[PDB]
TrEMBL record, chain B:
<feature type="domain" description="Smr">
    <location>
        <begin position="97"/>
        <end position="172"/>
    </location>
</feature>
<dbReference type="Pfam" id="PF01713">
    <property type="entry name" value="Smr"/>
</dbReference>
<keyword id="KW-0378">Hydrolase</keyword>
<dbReference type="InterPro" id="IPR036063">
    <property type="entry name" value="Smr_dom_sf"/>
</dbReference>
<dbReference type="GO" id="GO:0004521">
    <property type="term" value="F:RNA endonuclease activity"/>
</dbReference>
<comment type="function">
    <text>Acts as a ribosome collision sensor. Detects stalled/collided disomes (pairs of ribosomes where the leading ribosome is stalled and a second ribosome has collided with it) and endonucleolytically cleaves mRNA at the 5' boundary of the stalled ribosome. Stalled/collided disomes form a new interface (primarily via the 30S subunits) that binds SmrB. Cleaved mRNA becomes available for tmRNA ligation, leading to ribosomal subunit dissociation and rescue of stalled ribosomes.</text>
</comment>
<keyword id="KW-0255">Endonuclease</keyword>
<keyword id="KW-0699">rRNA-binding</keyword>
<dbReference type="GO" id="GO:0019843">
    <property type="term" value="F:rRNA binding"/>
</dbReference>
UniProtKB/TrEMBL annotation, chain C:
<comment type="similarity">
    <text>Belongs to the universal ribosomal protein uS5 family.</text>
</comment>
<comment type="function">
    <text>With S4 and S12 plays an important role in translational accuracy.</text>
</comment>
<dbReference type="GO" id="GO:0042254">
    <property type="term" value="P:ribosome biogenesis"/>
</dbReference>
<keyword id="KW-0694">RNA-binding</keyword>
<dbReference type="GO" id="GO:0019843">
    <property type="term" value="F:rRNA binding"/>
</dbReference>
<comment type="function">
    <text>Located at the back of the 30S subunit body where it stabilizes the conformation of the head with respect to the body.</text>
</comment>
<keyword id="KW-0687">Ribonucleoprotein</keyword>
<dbReference type="GO" id="GO:0005737">
    <property type="term" value="C:cytoplasm"/>
</dbReference>
<dbReference type="GO" id="GO:0006412">
    <property type="term" value="P:translation"/>
</dbReference>
Amino acid sequence: MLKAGVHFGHQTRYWNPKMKPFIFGARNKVHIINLEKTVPMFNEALAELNKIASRKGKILFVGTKRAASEAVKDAALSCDQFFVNHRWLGGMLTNWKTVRQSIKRLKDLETQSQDGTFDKLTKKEALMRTRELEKLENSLGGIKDMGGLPDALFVIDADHEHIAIKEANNLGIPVFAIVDTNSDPDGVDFVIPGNDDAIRAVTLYLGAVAATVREGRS
Amino acid sequence: KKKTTLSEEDQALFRQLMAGTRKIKQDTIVHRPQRKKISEVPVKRLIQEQADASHYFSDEFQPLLNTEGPVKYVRPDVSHFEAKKLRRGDYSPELFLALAGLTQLQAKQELGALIAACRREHVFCACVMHGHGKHILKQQTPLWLAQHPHVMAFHQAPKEYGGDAALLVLIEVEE
Amino acid sequence: ELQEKLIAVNRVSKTVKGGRIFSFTALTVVGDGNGRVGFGYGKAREVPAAIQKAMEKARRNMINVALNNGTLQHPVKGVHTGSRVFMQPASEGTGIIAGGAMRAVLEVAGVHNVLAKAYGSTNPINVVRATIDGLENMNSPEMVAAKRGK
RNA sequence: GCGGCCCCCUGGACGAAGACUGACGCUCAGGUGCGAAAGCGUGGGGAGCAAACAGGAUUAGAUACCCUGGUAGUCCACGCCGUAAACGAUGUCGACUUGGAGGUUGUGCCCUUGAGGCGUGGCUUCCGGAGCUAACGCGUUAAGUCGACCGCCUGGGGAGUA
RNA sequence: CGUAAAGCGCACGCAGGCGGUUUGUUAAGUCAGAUGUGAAAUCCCCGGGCUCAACCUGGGAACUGCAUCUGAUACUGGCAA
RNA sequence: AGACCAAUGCCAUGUACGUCGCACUCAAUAGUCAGUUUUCUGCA
């Protein structure tokens, strides 16, 4: 709701002509996003995104670059929602089938880990198995309790996370992206011209989104 | 109607704060994506849901089902009383699936579709009719159903819903 | 009401280290009989696995066609790779009279009585791809009147 | 195709502002001109290089590759020839259609507060979007989207031969 | 017609083909109608006779053309500005 | 970096790729009519 405070746009380099409607674009070789265009765009994204959030849907924040972590873990986990913060595996939506059995192995190995037989029979293989829980835990972290493929997708950079956008367009999932002036509005259904790599901007930004996901009529 | 926003004068002030002349005025044709239908549910999504649901039905894996009596199954963590309720007919199925005459492959797909539909429509109880066969759908289908994570419990259907030729199935739904 | 039919099976080869290895490719088209046409390619090591992968890919990837009463609407030309294809609505111009591998897609497409004549290449894998492209960019009088106002 | 420097005679291109003519334009079969190199004719020149040629090697042989010599030729004047993988293997002229990084040559504006900032032309290089393409790739210098006129193609060989 | 066959080695240019934009006139091309002709048979259509059919046959359509007259003037051409 | 390395009878190659099934039986409701006369029957 609050006016974007401190980002005003970025990316002098590799700017994309399809971002030409969103650029004010003056200072010191770098491009300034027209935030007077961003505010209606971002309010629309909060509108439809709250609309699917009230229908009891799953949202899947996507935060692979740094420092979108742990800001996407903090914002998704502040809601009762899901996230990807480390490397987004190629095909966790379009073959979720195979990713379902990897999530199943993460559940079986944490149940085996903190409760069952973890000290049993070996030290070396037990260390091997625990670092399998680090690898499967940081890759399949947020998505491990989803149990479906989600009803929307909220990516924090459109060019850095083009794979996830390409799959959610492949599957008919609404993509909500904060694009920058280098990115491309591929199949992003609700584009938001913003700043992808400022931590102030993405914490303000995810703060608003996580605010409207759990917003409660009460 | 225009959404509430900072005043135009305020926007101009933001423009004033912008260091330098600080104005970008490139004009280009603008294309806006059509708004998604409220109903949604595109056939492709449905097909995808079906495929996802049927993915669990393996011919190689055989869950241990009770060999004594009418066919029944309860998923670990679900109250055993649910199977009893199915037997007594406490649950009235809202969806009916007829598998009789289908190949195994077709049947798996239809079962997947049924489960997807139950989830989508928040239907908790469905009836699956497989007919009577030896080493056929009548035997293979319960095994496939058990392997599905959304299947909570099933029991031989009461006579009113097909008896020994049908199953009542309880499906886990997000509400 | 699925109405599947196979057009072409071939034996392709690979030429590994020790001799050659022979694989089989199917090419099928399914369709309900009222628009809704799909094709699938599918390739496997034996013929029934190939046709099954082809049907399974063809049941998805299925396209709507805006039919007329039982036929096309206006004459349409679809091209794909080297394969140029003409079609003409033939307002009850009886019987589907199309080339091979075009008769099948037009048959399960639900159209009954058009006139065709494929030109150029007439490889079956590209003469469909030039019938769907074709039937895809054929639009109806309620779509043209939707576009241009009335 | 043109590579030291200088003079003389001379062709074109591009840019800036303004003036003038007023469709005078585009393409072009036959026709005419120019057209690398080798070659030919007449007369010069001839250092290097070098077909031919000779010798030495190498080799089974070596009319070759390698070595040592070496004539025409290459150089100049005038005339002929009239061809090349004469190739961006892409005819000429015009119009339209997202971009990025350079090079080169003009010109305008702004504190020129420097080897700057903002534009606007001409030619050119690399990469790529849509589109096209059998593919490879082309991609505002198109092989995209069109128009005008010309040239040429129609299976391989025989044969670009008689 | 880059690489499959196919862009003259490159230009200049005659005859030829094509030609920005506005107004007026003409009406040659173009279009509309009319008239004369386009033989009959044959093809096509609707009927009729051979027991049916082939066949024969009545009427029409057609013969996509040409010529002349009457108009229309948007485009192309001619002429004037 | 940069010696020297020539040639390799005659044929046809293939069979060969076209797909399925199930069933079943247990019960009501023949016939039965009548039954002397009365009456104390713990108490606060």
